[PDB]
Design an enzyme around this catalytic site. Structure first.
Site, PDB file in Angstrom:
ATOM      1  N   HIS B  39       0.803  -1.393   0.119  1.00 25.85           N
ATOM      2  CA  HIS B  39      -0.102  -0.013  -0.017  1.00 25.85           C
ATOM      3  C   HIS B  39       0.764   1.277   0.092  1.00 25.85           C
ATOM      4  O   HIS B  39       0.233   2.451  -0.077  1.00 25.85           O
ATOM      5  CB  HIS B  39      -1.050   0.194   1.114  1.00 25.85           C
ATOM      6  CG  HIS B  39      -0.590   0.083   2.475  1.00 25.85           C
ATOM      7  ND1 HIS B  39      -0.300  -1.062   3.230  1.00 25.85           N
ATOM      8  CD2 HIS B  39      -0.370   1.160   3.272  1.00 25.85           C
ATOM      9  CE1 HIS B  39      -0.017  -0.556   4.338  1.00 25.85           C
ATOM     10  NE2 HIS B  39      -0.005   0.705   4.603  1.00 25.85           N
ATOM     11  N   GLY B 141       2.568   5.758  11.116  1.00 27.94           N
ATOM     12  CA  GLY B 141       3.944   5.593  10.412  1.00 27.94           C
ATOM     13  C   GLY B 141       4.522   4.335  10.764  1.00 27.94           C
ATOM     14  O   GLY B 141       5.609   4.061  10.285  1.00 27.94           O
ATOM     15  N   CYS B 143       3.555   1.144   9.589  1.00 32.85           N
ATOM     16  CA  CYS B 143       3.571   0.313   8.980  1.00 32.85           C
ATOM     17  C   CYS B 143       4.859  -0.125   8.314  1.00 32.85           C
ATOM     18  O   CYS B 143       5.726   0.509   7.965  1.00 32.85           O
ATOM     19  CB  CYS B 143       2.701   0.815   7.642  1.00 32.85           C
ATOM     20  SG  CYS B 143       0.726   0.754   8.068  1.00 32.85           S
TER      21      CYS B 143
END
Lengths: 298, 299
Positions: B39, B141, B143
């Site tokens: 993503h 933040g 991920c």
């Protein structure tokens, strides 16, 4: 959840120190290895050690320092309080920016538990008001260190020496001064009566409200002095105005005034938790500082 | 007993940041490949129903900014495996540890190195719940932060972070990009299944109590495994598998308490609830310490 600092900058500093039959951990910063001075004692010496006397009788060659698989030659040795400082021929190329600090009771740090100079585990500890820590340390852990990290500077605050018969742990700062009234002699030792870190319990109640748990709140208010009278009664440490200010940002985030949270804590001490839990705990938790909460609650 | 994370240094040296457009997440740099959540390629508009294949067709190597600290690593290839993007870079990471990619079972624990913009921030132990979520601190933040275990200097990477559910729990993938649980990487209404108690870990905790001399709950009864599982489910406990019985082997040998006898002890606690008595100083049973966790702390 308790959260530790990333340990890599400290892992690069751990070494093994052997003298006679005894092997423990040391901390290698620049050209010095720091370790507990009891590494020099036999099992008989520990019963009552005159440490100087044992130390004058050792040479540099009686100390074997191992960093990974490479031996470091000891070129010098000296003693600062309960810490031995072994000067070695090789500075550590992985030395981080660092400071030695003596921490205050109620403050937290990360512990890198190590065996044979090899890191094993990392976890958070608080310095109790009675200057013990509730750690996880087995035979061979002595010389493991505690630390905080601010940006890329490592502030070392603890070196591990002892386990009391109650299972709690005691050690020194990196200047070799014990936290608490303890001595590096194998004689029976008990800590002072422990107390609960009030400002930390308050910070944790704020974390609970932030995470949705609010059953314990009320509109009862209290004055600071009236709260402290109850705190003293239940063996909680005093809450100062400095502590009230430190809780400011948590108070703003939740909209619950510091003294209103004091009033809730007072009710919990007087009428307990009613078989209910806070943040999954059946007990009031006091090992998170305000800083630890705010670092995780934003 | 304390929850203890593994030392994080070997993983810290693999953390980078990956930016595509205005989106920066963390990636894992092993050899000459950087792994991160796919993503990163989505814009805010792509997320309700992203076509990942079509979004990636549009991208070129020159669209990915990979940085170790502030040092850019040139991207020389890109591909997608399930929900993970793999970016081949021109430099092999000199800090690559010995490693493997493993897919863990529910109930197993691992350490998470929470990172923001490629910079490690903290480390803590997590258990994968039976409903395939984890609880822990993952802020915006985070991920691309990873979860791992370390055995004999080999890092087994098992988790890469992707999402936070409405309930506050976290979900993610293994390092082959396959989600744990029924989750999909798109911004649609998704709910965690009903959670249950990790029976094998409660049994490990009972063995830890016995090792420490706290053994009042041991009884004279035994059970069959099927009988136990049928009762356990009425108390929202997970059923035991043969693999769970096997992983309890070492603690059963150390204590001399057969696994099925400990199960009968646990069955009694569940039915005739602990009337005030504590175990290891806890009125509640703990379910996030595995048999492996127990051996490491007791021995």
């Amino acid at each position: 959840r308790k959260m530790a600092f990333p340990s890599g900058k400290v892992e690069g500093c751990m070494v093994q120190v052997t003298c006679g039959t005894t092997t423990l951990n040391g901390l290698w910063l620049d050209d010095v290895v720091y370790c507990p001075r009891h590494v020099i004692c036999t099992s008989e010496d520990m019963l009552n050690p005159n440490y100087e006397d044992l130390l004058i009788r050792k040479s540099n060659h009686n100390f074997l320092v191992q960093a990974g698989n490479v031996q470091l030659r000891v070129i010098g040795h000296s003693m600062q309080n309960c810490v031995l400082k072994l000067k070695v021929d090789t500075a550590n190329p992985k030395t981080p920016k660092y400071k030695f600090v003596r921490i205050q009771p109620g403050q937290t740090f990360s512990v890198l538990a190590c065996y044979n100079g090899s890191p094993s585990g990392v976890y958070q500890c608080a310095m109790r008001p009675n200057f013990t820590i509730k750690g996880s340390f087995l035979n061979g852990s002595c010389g493991s260190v505690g630390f905080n990290i601010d940006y890329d500077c490592v502030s070392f605050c603890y070196m591990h020496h002892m386990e009391l018969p109650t299972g709690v742990h005691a050690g020194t700062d990196l200047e070799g001064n014990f936290y608490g009234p303890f001595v590096d002699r194998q004689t029976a030792q008990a800590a002072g009566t422990d107390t609960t870190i009030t400002v930390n319990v308050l910070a944790w109640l704020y974390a609970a409200v932030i995470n949705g748990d609010r059953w314990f709140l009320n509109r009862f208010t209290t004055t600071l002095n009236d709260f402290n009278l109850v705190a003293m009664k239940y063996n909680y440490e005093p809450l100062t105005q400095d502590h009230v200010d430190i809780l400011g940002p948590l108070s703003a985030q939740t909209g619950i005034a510091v003294l209103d949270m004091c009033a809730s804590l007072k009710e919990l001490l007087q009428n307990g938790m009613n078989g209910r839990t806070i943040l999954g705990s059946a007990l009031l938790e006091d090992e998170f500082t305000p800083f630890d909460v705010v670092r995780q609650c934003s």
